[PDB]
Amino acid sequence: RLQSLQTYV
Amino acid sequence: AQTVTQSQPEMSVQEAETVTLSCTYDTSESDYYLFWYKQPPSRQMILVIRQEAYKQQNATENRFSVNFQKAAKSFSLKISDSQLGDAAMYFCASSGNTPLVFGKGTRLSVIPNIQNPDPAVYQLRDSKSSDKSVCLFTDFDSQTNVSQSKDSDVYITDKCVLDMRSMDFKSNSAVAWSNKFACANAFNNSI
Amino acid sequence: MIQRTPKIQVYSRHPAENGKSNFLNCYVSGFHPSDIEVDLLKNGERIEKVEHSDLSFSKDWSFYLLYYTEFTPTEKDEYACRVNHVTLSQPKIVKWDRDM
Amino acid sequence: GSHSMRYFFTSVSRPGRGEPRFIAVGYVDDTQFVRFDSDAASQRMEPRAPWIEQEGPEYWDGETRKVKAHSQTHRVDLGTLRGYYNQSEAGSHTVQRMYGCDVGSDWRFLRGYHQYAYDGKDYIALKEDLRSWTAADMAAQTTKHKWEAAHVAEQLRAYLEGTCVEWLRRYLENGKETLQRTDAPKTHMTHHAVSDHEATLRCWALSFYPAEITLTWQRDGEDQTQDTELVETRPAGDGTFQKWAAVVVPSGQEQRYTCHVQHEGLPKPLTLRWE
Amino acid sequence: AGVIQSPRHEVTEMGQEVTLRCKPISGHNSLFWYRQTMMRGLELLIYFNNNVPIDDSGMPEDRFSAKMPNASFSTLKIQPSEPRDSAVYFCASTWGRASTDTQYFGPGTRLTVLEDLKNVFPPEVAVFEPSEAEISHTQKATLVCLATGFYPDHVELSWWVNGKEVHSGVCTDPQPLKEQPALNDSRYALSSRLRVSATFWQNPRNHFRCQVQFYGLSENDEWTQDRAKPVTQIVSAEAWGRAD
């Protein structure tokens, strides 16, 4: 199950 | 897979009393954020509370506290010493696959506590013409229900609480008007 | 930019039995960037129905892939793997060897 | 045994030939179980193991929603990083991300990790404590400050210590027959005369799981790396692995040499000789 | 210095084109589009990070589109407009470092798509001076402003004392009412009270203006009815203080 959080560099 | 539930669509609190706005949510994540948003009739959305689901502590913002029960998936908003400015729509929200998902919303109506009821009806006249005129029903306490115009040619608005902030005074008022009608029997049915 | 040459291992899924059906594997690993072209040869011909696995990588961030197809080895059939990658002067061909 | 779940992201820009390709792969131990490929037709998170197929349609809907969004964030990252490094828009560049959780044999949280790479080298990574960041160069310091303001480390930590481990336990039960087995290696030794006088003893290990094995060569009961070839462990293609070791020996000296095999599937380490 | 939305209200005839517009907070790298109805609530339409659409699963099947040409603005375009599209369309921006960044919302753009414009009416406005019986009994003075016979419900009522907009002591109806409640296309009426102290209203130099911003047709809309074109306009009524 993936992490839902989106992170941008 | 990610839903927010606000079951009571209408809530009422007496001025200065405290009110709890319930919210439950559904998620299968352990990293998420919970939010409470407030929407006045201005329609501008503004953030009230933020709860990071990893932080165990119930986030508080002055009068605004939150009852975060991670186990029960509940996130109720407590508003203590409610004020007229708190009358708005409150939206529960959660982070997830969609950055923000909103609940249906609850409309909190704040009942003004009239300190000295003093019901009266007055006649005001137009400032351009002197033929047209309106009737003002004002200063009644909050449990009064104004009634719509069963007279067809007449219009009666609902009650409207205004705040004279620098006199610490608050009043309810409704308005009536007609074509070419007396004010004493204009709110004849409101009783 | 870091550039990493691939390591090529051609082999079979099971011990080779002449006439018995098997799977021919070409395992390219430790390469970077990920652009890579891999074919499986049967006597110099590109076997056309060859599947592959999904791109992953290791701790040094280099990539690895498995290319496999159905084959039935014999004694004189020659199988091989052709690999092309930006780090090579020209396509490297590694012959299949049932002892390896 | 101890277990782990790991996700791998790879985005490759291709200027002038369309949107960047995004590949996402999911792993429990050495078993790949999910996949997403931005060029593939389905545009869905697809199963790559049978035990994951018993997840319902809402699971596959949510994994597809997350991985489709993650493909785009990394598409953005390629452009962001290109600017950080003053790079032309002509070159192909690569973005890589890897995170996951280790559990002990009591199946409770042991270790978490979350690493980012740009162009095959370190960019930014979480430290073992899951609280601070290791920024590789100075461009990564920009991202470090961005992610410290958003409190990103505390959010990854919440996933790794929570959702990551708890779904790894569910996968280990959903596929107990596949994921909890240990397959002891099928070992044999081959002899290949290549010279008039010299020979190769090759020591095989086949069809084992997990991939962790040790093959060492001994001469007269003494360890020897001189004149030995070791190949890196490779997949057979059926969920098992292979590895072999070879040594070059003079003829008539073959039976001085013993091969040794260590694998958790074996009650005792195997010894092999030429016979 | 907030999320700017262009314009506040917008009234369009069906079949026409609609282009909502939004400017994020300067520095913000992420921008979200929402629409609000009271049937479905607040629904995400599309959001962008660095001008790249991250998700558009919430966008309608066929007449909706969105671009973010540069960090400074994004447009949402409906083509062709339909009455079912009537809603408030909100824009929000975040810093764009994580999907949990707090979202900063704009004032919204209320869009109304009518079947035709033949029933659009500007408001008439009148100010009514306080009853002196009220002044004698309460030492307070309630003015009243009536906004009459407008359609659709696209009015913005403000009070203006001596050139400065006043919110304190003001009360405007949350809902209009129908002048002919039997009709669906019936025009609307809206009232508002402003209560000052008696001495303030008794000052002959105090100036009270009731201003009603109405949003109607552009001059690009066509019009062939036997009355003034109901264009976007302001209608005011006023009154001064009275010593006696």
Side-chain angles (χ1 to χ4, degrees), chain C residues 36-45 47 50-58 60-81:
Chain C
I36 209 174
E37 201 162 43
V38 175
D39 302 291
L40 305 190
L41 299 187
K42 178 193 166 289
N43 289 321
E45 283 145 28
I47 306 183
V50 47
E51 297 169 42
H52 57 66
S53 72
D54 295 294
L55 188 68
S56 177
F57 50 84
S58 323
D60 66 344
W61 300 106
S62 62
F63 299 111
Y64 63 83
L65 281 174
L66 179 68
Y67 285 75
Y68 59 109
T69 197
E70 301 236 48
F71 87 131
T72 324
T74 71
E75 250 272 356
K76 310 262 186 123
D77 279 322
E78 300 179 6
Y79 298 90
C81 187

Short mmCIF file of all heavy atoms in Angstrom, two decimals, chain C residues 36-81, unseen atoms left out:
data_model
loop_
_atom_site.label_atom_id
_atom_site.label_comp_id
_atom_site.label_asym_id
_atom_site.label_seq_id
_atom_site.Cartn_x
_atom_site.Cartn_y
_atom_site.Cartn_z
N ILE C 36 17.98 1.01 -22.10
CA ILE C 36 18.70 -0.21 -22.44
C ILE C 36 17.85 -1.00 -23.44
O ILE C 36 16.62 -0.98 -23.38
CB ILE C 36 19.03 -1.04 -21.18
CG1 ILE C 36 20.31 -1.87 -21.39
CG2 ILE C 36 17.87 -1.95 -20.77
CD1 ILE C 36 20.77 -2.59 -20.13
N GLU C 37 18.52 -1.66 -24.38
CA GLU C 37 17.86 -2.51 -25.36
C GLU C 37 18.44 -3.91 -25.25
O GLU C 37 19.66 -4.09 -25.34
CB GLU C 37 18.04 -1.97 -26.78
CG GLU C 37 16.99 -2.48 -27.76
CD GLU C 37 16.90 -1.63 -29.01
OE1 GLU C 37 17.96 -1.24 -29.55
OE2 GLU C 37 15.77 -1.36 -29.46
N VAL C 38 17.56 -4.89 -25.04
CA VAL C 38 17.96 -6.27 -24.81
C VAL C 38 17.15 -7.16 -25.74
O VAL C 38 15.92 -7.09 -25.76
CB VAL C 38 17.74 -6.69 -23.34
CG1 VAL C 38 18.06 -8.16 -23.15
CG2 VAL C 38 18.60 -5.83 -22.42
N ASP C 39 17.85 -7.99 -26.51
CA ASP C 39 17.22 -9.01 -27.34
C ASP C 39 17.80 -10.37 -26.98
O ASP C 39 18.91 -10.48 -26.46
CB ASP C 39 17.42 -8.73 -28.84
CG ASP C 39 16.87 -7.38 -29.26
OD1 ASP C 39 15.63 -7.20 -29.26
OD2 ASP C 39 17.68 -6.49 -29.60
N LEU C 40 17.03 -11.41 -27.27
CA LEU C 40 17.47 -12.79 -27.12
C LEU C 40 17.61 -13.41 -28.50
O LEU C 40 16.68 -13.33 -29.31
CB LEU C 40 16.49 -13.59 -26.26
CG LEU C 40 16.20 -13.00 -24.88
CD1 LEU C 40 15.42 -13.99 -24.03
CD2 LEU C 40 17.50 -12.61 -24.20
N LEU C 41 18.75 -14.03 -28.76
CA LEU C 41 19.07 -14.56 -30.08
C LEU C 41 18.94 -16.08 -30.09
O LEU C 41 19.36 -16.75 -29.15
CB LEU C 41 20.47 -14.14 -30.52
CG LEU C 41 20.72 -12.63 -30.64
CD1 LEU C 41 22.08 -12.35 -31.24
CD2 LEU C 41 19.63 -11.98 -31.47
N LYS C 42 18.35 -16.60 -31.16
CA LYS C 42 18.35 -18.03 -31.47
C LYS C 42 19.06 -18.17 -32.82
O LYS C 42 18.44 -17.98 -33.87
CB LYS C 42 16.94 -18.62 -31.50
CG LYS C 42 16.89 -20.10 -31.86
CD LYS C 42 15.47 -20.57 -32.17
CE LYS C 42 15.46 -21.94 -32.84
NZ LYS C 42 15.97 -21.89 -34.25
N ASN C 43 20.35 -18.50 -32.77
CA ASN C 43 21.20 -18.66 -33.96
C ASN C 43 21.33 -17.35 -34.73
O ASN C 43 21.30 -17.33 -35.96
CB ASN C 43 20.68 -19.78 -34.87
CG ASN C 43 20.89 -21.16 -34.27
OD1 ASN C 43 21.93 -21.43 -33.66
ND2 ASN C 43 19.91 -22.03 -34.43
N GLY C 44 21.49 -16.25 -34.00
CA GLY C 44 21.68 -14.94 -34.59
C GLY C 44 20.40 -14.19 -34.91
O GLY C 44 20.48 -13.03 -35.34
N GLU C 45 19.24 -14.80 -34.71
CA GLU C 45 17.96 -14.16 -35.01
C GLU C 45 17.35 -13.60 -33.74
O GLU C 45 17.46 -14.21 -32.67
CB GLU C 45 16.99 -15.16 -35.64
CG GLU C 45 17.27 -15.47 -37.10
CD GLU C 45 16.96 -16.90 -37.44
OE1 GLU C 45 16.07 -17.48 -36.77
OE2 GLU C 45 17.59 -17.44 -38.38
N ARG C 46 16.71 -12.45 -33.85
CA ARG C 46 16.01 -11.87 -32.71
C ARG C 46 14.74 -12.67 -32.44
O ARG C 46 13.80 -12.64 -33.24
CB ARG C 46 15.69 -10.40 -32.97
N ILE C 47 14.72 -13.40 -31.32
CA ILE C 47 13.47 -13.98 -30.85
C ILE C 47 12.51 -12.85 -30.52
O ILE C 47 12.86 -11.91 -29.79
CB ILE C 47 13.72 -14.89 -29.63
CG1 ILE C 47 14.79 -15.94 -29.95
CG2 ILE C 47 12.43 -15.55 -29.18
CD1 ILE C 47 15.04 -16.91 -28.81
N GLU C 48 11.29 -12.92 -31.05
CA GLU C 48 10.44 -11.73 -31.08
C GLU C 48 9.46 -11.64 -29.91
O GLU C 48 9.12 -10.53 -29.49
CB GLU C 48 9.68 -11.66 -32.41
N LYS C 49 9.01 -12.77 -29.38
CA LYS C 49 8.00 -12.76 -28.31
C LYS C 49 8.64 -12.85 -26.93
O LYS C 49 8.26 -13.67 -26.11
CB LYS C 49 7.01 -13.90 -28.52
N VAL C 50 9.60 -11.97 -26.64
CA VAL C 50 10.38 -12.03 -25.41
C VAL C 50 9.83 -10.99 -24.43
O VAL C 50 9.78 -9.80 -24.74
CB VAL C 50 11.88 -11.82 -25.67
CG1 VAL C 50 12.11 -10.62 -26.59
CG2 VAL C 50 12.63 -11.64 -24.36
N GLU C 51 9.43 -11.45 -23.25
CA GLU C 51 8.92 -10.56 -22.21
C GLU C 51 10.06 -10.06 -21.32
O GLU C 51 11.21 -10.51 -21.42
CB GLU C 51 7.86 -11.28 -21.37
CG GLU C 51 6.63 -11.69 -22.15
CD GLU C 51 5.72 -12.63 -21.36
OE1 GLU C 51 5.52 -12.38 -20.15
OE2 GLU C 51 5.22 -13.61 -21.95
N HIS C 52 9.73 -9.11 -20.45
CA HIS C 52 10.71 -8.59 -19.50
C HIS C 52 10.01 -8.21 -18.20
O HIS C 52 8.78 -8.11 -18.14
CB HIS C 52 11.47 -7.38 -20.07
CG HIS C 52 10.59 -6.25 -20.50
ND1 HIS C 52 9.84 -5.51 -19.62
CD2 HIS C 52 10.36 -5.72 -21.73
CE1 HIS C 52 9.18 -4.58 -20.28
NE2 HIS C 52 9.47 -4.69 -21.56
N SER C 53 10.81 -8.03 -17.16
CA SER C 53 10.33 -7.62 -15.85
C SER C 53 10.28 -6.09 -15.78
O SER C 53 10.59 -5.39 -16.74
CB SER C 53 11.22 -8.19 -14.75
OG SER C 53 12.46 -7.51 -14.72
N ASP C 54 9.92 -5.58 -14.61
CA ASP C 54 9.71 -4.15 -14.43
C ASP C 54 10.92 -3.49 -13.79
O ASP C 54 11.52 -4.02 -12.85
CB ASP C 54 8.46 -3.90 -13.58
CG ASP C 54 7.20 -4.38 -14.28
OD1 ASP C 54 6.84 -3.80 -15.33
OD2 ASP C 54 6.59 -5.35 -13.78
N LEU C 55 11.27 -2.32 -14.32
CA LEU C 55 12.49 -1.62 -13.94
C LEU C 55 12.54 -1.35 -12.45
O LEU C 55 11.63 -0.72 -11.88
CB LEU C 55 12.57 -0.31 -14.72
CG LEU C 55 13.88 0.46 -14.61
CD1 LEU C 55 15.00 -0.31 -15.28
CD2 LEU C 55 13.70 1.84 -15.22
N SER C 56 13.60 -1.83 -11.80
CA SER C 56 13.88 -1.52 -10.41
C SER C 56 15.37 -1.21 -10.31
O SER C 56 16.09 -1.18 -11.31
CB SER C 56 13.48 -2.68 -9.48
OG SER C 56 13.82 -2.39 -8.14
N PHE C 57 15.85 -0.97 -9.09
CA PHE C 57 17.23 -0.56 -8.90
C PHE C 57 17.71 -0.98 -7.52
O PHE C 57 16.92 -1.40 -6.67
CB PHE C 57 17.39 0.96 -9.11
CG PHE C 57 16.41 1.79 -8.33
CD1 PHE C 57 16.65 2.13 -7.01
CD2 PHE C 57 15.25 2.26 -8.94
CE1 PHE C 57 15.75 2.91 -6.31
CE2 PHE C 57 14.35 3.04 -8.24
CZ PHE C 57 14.60 3.37 -6.92
N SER C 58 19.02 -0.86 -7.32
CA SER C 58 19.69 -1.31 -6.10
C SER C 58 20.24 -0.12 -5.31
O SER C 58 19.95 1.04 -5.62
CB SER C 58 20.80 -2.31 -6.45
OG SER C 58 20.42 -3.16 -7.52
N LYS C 59 21.04 -0.43 -4.29
CA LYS C 59 21.46 0.58 -3.32
C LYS C 59 22.36 1.64 -3.94
O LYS C 59 22.34 2.80 -3.53
CB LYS C 59 22.19 -0.09 -2.15
CG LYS C 59 21.94 0.56 -0.81
CD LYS C 59 20.49 0.94 -0.64
N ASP C 60 23.16 1.27 -4.95
CA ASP C 60 23.98 2.24 -5.66
C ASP C 60 23.19 3.00 -6.72
O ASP C 60 23.79 3.71 -7.53
CB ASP C 60 25.18 1.53 -6.29
CG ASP C 60 24.78 0.56 -7.38
OD1 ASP C 60 23.60 0.19 -7.46
OD2 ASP C 60 25.68 0.16 -8.18
N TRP C 61 21.86 2.86 -6.71
CA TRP C 61 20.88 3.47 -7.62
C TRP C 61 20.93 2.91 -9.04
O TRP C 61 20.19 3.40 -9.90
CB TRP C 61 21.02 5.00 -7.68
CG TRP C 61 20.83 5.66 -6.37
CD1 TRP C 61 21.79 6.22 -5.58
CD2 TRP C 61 19.59 5.84 -5.67
NE1 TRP C 61 21.24 6.74 -4.44
CE2 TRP C 61 19.89 6.52 -4.47
CE3 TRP C 61 18.26 5.50 -5.94
CZ2 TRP C 61 18.90 6.86 -3.54
CZ3 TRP C 61 17.28 5.84 -5.02
CH2 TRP C 61 17.61 6.51 -3.83
N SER C 62 21.75 1.91 -9.32
CA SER C 62 21.82 1.34 -10.65
C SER C 62 20.62 0.42 -10.91
O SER C 62 20.07 -0.19 -9.99
CB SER C 62 23.12 0.56 -10.84
OG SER C 62 23.19 -0.51 -9.92
N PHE C 63 20.24 0.31 -12.18
CA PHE C 63 19.04 -0.40 -12.58
C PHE C 63 19.33 -1.87 -12.89
O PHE C 63 20.48 -2.28 -13.09
CB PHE C 63 18.42 0.27 -13.80
CG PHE C 63 18.00 1.68 -13.55
CD1 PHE C 63 18.67 2.74 -14.15
CD2 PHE C 63 16.94 1.96 -12.70
CE1 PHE C 63 18.27 4.04 -13.91
CE2 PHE C 63 16.54 3.26 -12.46
CZ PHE C 63 17.21 4.31 -13.07
N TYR C 64 18.26 -2.67 -12.94
CA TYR C 64 18.37 -4.07 -13.33
C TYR C 64 17.06 -4.55 -13.92
O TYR C 64 15.97 -4.13 -13.51
CB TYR C 64 18.80 -4.96 -12.15
CG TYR C 64 17.84 -5.03 -10.98
CD1 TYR C 64 16.74 -5.89 -11.00
CD2 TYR C 64 18.06 -4.27 -9.84
CE1 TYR C 64 15.88 -5.97 -9.92
CE2 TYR C 64 17.20 -4.35 -8.76
CZ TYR C 64 16.11 -5.20 -8.81
OH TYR C 64 15.26 -5.28 -7.73
N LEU C 65 17.18 -5.46 -14.89
CA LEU C 65 16.05 -5.97 -15.65
C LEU C 65 16.28 -7.45 -15.94
O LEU C 65 17.42 -7.90 -16.08
CB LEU C 65 15.87 -5.23 -16.98
CG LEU C 65 15.20 -3.86 -16.98
CD1 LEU C 65 15.28 -3.27 -18.38
CD2 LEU C 65 13.76 -3.98 -16.52
N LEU C 66 15.18 -8.20 -16.05
CA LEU C 66 15.23 -9.60 -16.46
C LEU C 66 14.44 -9.76 -17.75
O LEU C 66 13.25 -9.44 -17.80
CB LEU C 66 14.67 -10.52 -15.38
CG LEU C 66 14.69 -11.99 -15.81
CD1 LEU C 66 16.13 -12.49 -15.92
CD2 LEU C 66 13.88 -12.86 -14.87
N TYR C 67 15.11 -10.26 -18.79
CA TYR C 67 14.47 -10.60 -20.05
C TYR C 67 14.41 -12.11 -20.17
O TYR C 67 15.42 -12.80 -19.99
CB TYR C 67 15.23 -10.00 -21.23
CG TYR C 67 15.04 -8.52 -21.40
CD1 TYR C 67 15.66 -7.62 -20.55
CD2 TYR C 67 14.24 -8.01 -22.42
CE1 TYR C 67 15.49 -6.26 -20.70
CE2 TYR C 67 14.07 -6.65 -22.59
CZ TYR C 67 14.70 -5.78 -21.72
OH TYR C 67 14.53 -4.42 -21.88
N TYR C 68 13.22 -12.63 -20.48
CA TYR C 68 13.01 -14.07 -20.51
C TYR C 68 12.05 -14.42 -21.63
O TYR C 68 11.17 -13.63 -21.99
CB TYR C 68 12.48 -14.59 -19.17
CG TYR C 68 11.16 -13.98 -18.73
CD1 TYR C 68 9.99 -14.73 -18.75
CD2 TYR C 68 11.09 -12.66 -18.30
CE1 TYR C 68 8.79 -14.18 -18.35
CE2 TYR C 68 9.89 -12.10 -17.90
CZ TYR C 68 8.74 -12.87 -17.93
OH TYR C 68 7.55 -12.32 -17.53
N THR C 69 12.23 -15.62 -22.20
CA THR C 69 11.32 -16.13 -23.21
C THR C 69 11.32 -17.65 -23.13
O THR C 69 12.23 -18.27 -22.57
CB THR C 69 11.70 -15.66 -24.62
OG1 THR C 69 10.59 -15.85 -25.51
CG2 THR C 69 12.90 -16.44 -25.15
N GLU C 70 10.27 -18.25 -23.69
CA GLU C 70 10.19 -19.70 -23.77
C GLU C 70 11.16 -20.21 -24.83
O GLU C 70 11.22 -19.68 -25.94
CB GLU C 70 8.77 -20.14 -24.11
CG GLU C 70 7.72 -19.69 -23.12
CD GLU C 70 6.92 -20.85 -22.56
OE1 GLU C 70 7.54 -21.86 -22.15
OE2 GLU C 70 5.68 -20.75 -22.53
N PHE C 71 11.92 -21.25 -24.48
CA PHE C 71 12.79 -21.87 -25.47
C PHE C 71 12.96 -23.35 -25.13
O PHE C 71 12.76 -23.77 -23.98
CB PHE C 71 14.15 -21.15 -25.57
CG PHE C 71 15.20 -21.63 -24.58
CD1 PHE C 71 16.48 -21.94 -25.02
CD2 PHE C 71 14.92 -21.74 -23.23
CE1 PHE C 71 17.46 -22.37 -24.13
CE2 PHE C 71 15.89 -22.17 -22.33
CZ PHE C 71 17.16 -22.48 -22.79
N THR C 72 13.29 -24.13 -26.15
CA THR C 72 13.60 -25.55 -25.99
C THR C 72 15.02 -25.78 -26.48
O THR C 72 15.25 -25.87 -27.70
CB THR C 72 12.61 -26.43 -26.75
OG1 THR C 72 11.30 -25.83 -26.69
CG2 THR C 72 12.54 -27.81 -26.13
N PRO C 73 16.00 -25.88 -25.59
CA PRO C 73 17.40 -25.99 -26.03
C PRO C 73 17.69 -27.34 -26.65
O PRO C 73 17.08 -28.36 -26.31
CB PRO C 73 18.20 -25.79 -24.74
CG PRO C 73 17.28 -26.28 -23.66
CD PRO C 73 15.88 -25.95 -24.12
N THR C 74 18.62 -27.34 -27.60
CA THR C 74 19.15 -28.59 -28.14
C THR C 74 20.67 -28.61 -28.00
O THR C 74 21.24 -27.82 -27.24
CB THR C 74 18.74 -28.77 -29.61
OG1 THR C 74 19.44 -27.84 -30.44
CG2 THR C 74 17.24 -28.58 -29.79
N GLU C 75 21.33 -29.51 -28.73
CA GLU C 75 22.78 -29.62 -28.59
C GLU C 75 23.52 -28.58 -29.42
O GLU C 75 24.55 -28.05 -28.99
CB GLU C 75 23.24 -31.03 -28.99
CG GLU C 75 23.72 -31.88 -27.83
CD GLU C 75 25.20 -31.70 -27.54
OE1 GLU C 75 25.87 -30.96 -28.30
OE2 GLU C 75 25.70 -32.29 -26.56
N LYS C 76 23.01 -28.26 -30.61
CA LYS C 76 23.71 -27.40 -31.55
C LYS C 76 23.01 -26.07 -31.80
O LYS C 76 23.52 -25.25 -32.57
CB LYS C 76 23.93 -28.13 -32.88
CG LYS C 76 24.53 -29.51 -32.72
CD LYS C 76 26.03 -29.50 -32.96
CE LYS C 76 26.60 -30.90 -32.96
NZ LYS C 76 27.32 -31.21 -34.22
N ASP C 77 21.85 -25.85 -31.18
CA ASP C 77 21.23 -24.53 -31.20
C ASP C 77 22.04 -23.56 -30.35
O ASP C 77 22.43 -23.89 -29.23
CB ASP C 77 19.79 -24.62 -30.68
CG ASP C 77 18.82 -25.11 -31.73
OD1 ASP C 77 18.98 -24.72 -32.91
OD2 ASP C 77 17.89 -25.86 -31.38
N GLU C 78 22.29 -22.37 -30.89
CA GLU C 78 23.09 -21.36 -30.20
C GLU C 78 22.18 -20.21 -29.76
O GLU C 78 21.59 -19.52 -30.59
CB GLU C 78 24.21 -20.85 -31.11
CG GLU C 78 25.18 -21.93 -31.57
CD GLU C 78 26.26 -21.40 -32.49
OE1 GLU C 78 26.33 -20.17 -32.69
OE2 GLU C 78 27.04 -22.22 -33.02
N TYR C 79 22.07 -20.02 -28.45
CA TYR C 79 21.31 -18.92 -27.88
C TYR C 79 22.26 -17.90 -27.28
O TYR C 79 23.37 -18.23 -26.85
CB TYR C 79 20.33 -19.42 -26.82
CG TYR C 79 19.28 -20.37 -27.37
CD1 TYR C 79 19.51 -21.74 -27.41
CD2 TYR C 79 18.08 -19.89 -27.88
CE1 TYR C 79 18.56 -22.60 -27.92
CE2 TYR C 79 17.13 -20.75 -28.40
CZ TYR C 79 17.37 -22.11 -28.41
OH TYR C 79 16.44 -22.98 -28.93
N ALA C 80 21.83 -16.64 -27.26
CA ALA C 80 22.69 -15.55 -26.81
C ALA C 80 21.82 -14.37 -26.40
O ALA C 80 20.60 -14.37 -26.59
CB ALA C 80 23.70 -15.15 -27.89
N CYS C 81 22.47 -13.35 -25.85
CA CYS C 81 21.81 -12.12 -25.43
C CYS C 81 22.56 -10.94 -26.02
O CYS C 81 23.78 -10.83 -25.86
CB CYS C 81 21.75 -12.01 -23.92
SG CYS C 81 20.78 -10.62 -23.33
#
